[PDB]
Amino acid sequence: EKIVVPVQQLDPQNGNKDVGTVEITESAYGLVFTPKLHDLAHGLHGFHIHEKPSCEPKEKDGKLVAGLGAGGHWDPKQTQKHGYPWSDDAHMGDLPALFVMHDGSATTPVLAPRLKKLAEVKGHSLMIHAGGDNHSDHPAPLGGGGPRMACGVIK
């Protein structure tokens, strides 16, 4: 079985747009995230589980900012460090980056070896960023994902 996460491209002004789903399954080596997404910007994108079960915007420094309602990276073990999916020093929410092909589709599965059971990711959000992910806070915070492009709540 699979958790089916509906994902939307975020637009706080005009309303989110559906871009498909990400399926989460259990493998013998951890949780697999299998995207079935469309109409996204081509490239490799930061892909993380964020703390709050929300994809809503929040105002910050006078701005209505996409996805801020999700809070920060999911970090139950309180490492306070963005890092690699296979590093025990990194946020539990840190997943391998997600590849979107030329035609805007994403169908390449990725493994989160530190996550072991479907139950454990529910009540959090799944975030796809505009930027990539160097799995460090240096030199850009949170791997340089930057803006929150697409998001779905894990239920």
Contact status: 118 vs a copy of itself (CB under 8 A)? no
Contact status: 73 vs Zn ion (CB under 5 A)? yes
How near is the Cβ of 82 to Zn ion at its closest, in Å?
4
Angstrom distance (rounded) from CA 125 to CA 145: 15
How near is the Cβ of 78 to a copy of itself at its closest, in Å?
19
DSSP conformational letter for 113 = T
Tell me if 135 is assigned to a ligand binding site.
no
Contact status: 82 vs Zn ion (CB under 5 A)? yes
Nearer to Cu ion, 48 or 135 (CB): 48
Q: Which long-range contacts (CB under 8 A, 24 or more apart) does 4-9 make?
A: 5/126, 5/152, 5/153, 5/154, 5/155, 6/152, 7/37, 7/126, 7/128, 7/150, 7/151, 7/152, 8/55, 8/150, 8/151, 8/152, 9/39, 9/40, 9/149, 9/150
Instruction: Lay out the site mask for a copy of itself across 22-61 (x = CB under 8 A, - = otherwise).
Output: -----xxxx-x-----------x-----------------
Contacting positions for Cu ion (CB under 5 A): 48, 127
Instruction: Return the range that interacts with Zn ion (CB under 5 A); candidates 21-29, 30-38, 71-79, 116-124.
Output: 71-79
The binding site consists of 48, 50, 73, 82, 91, 94, 129
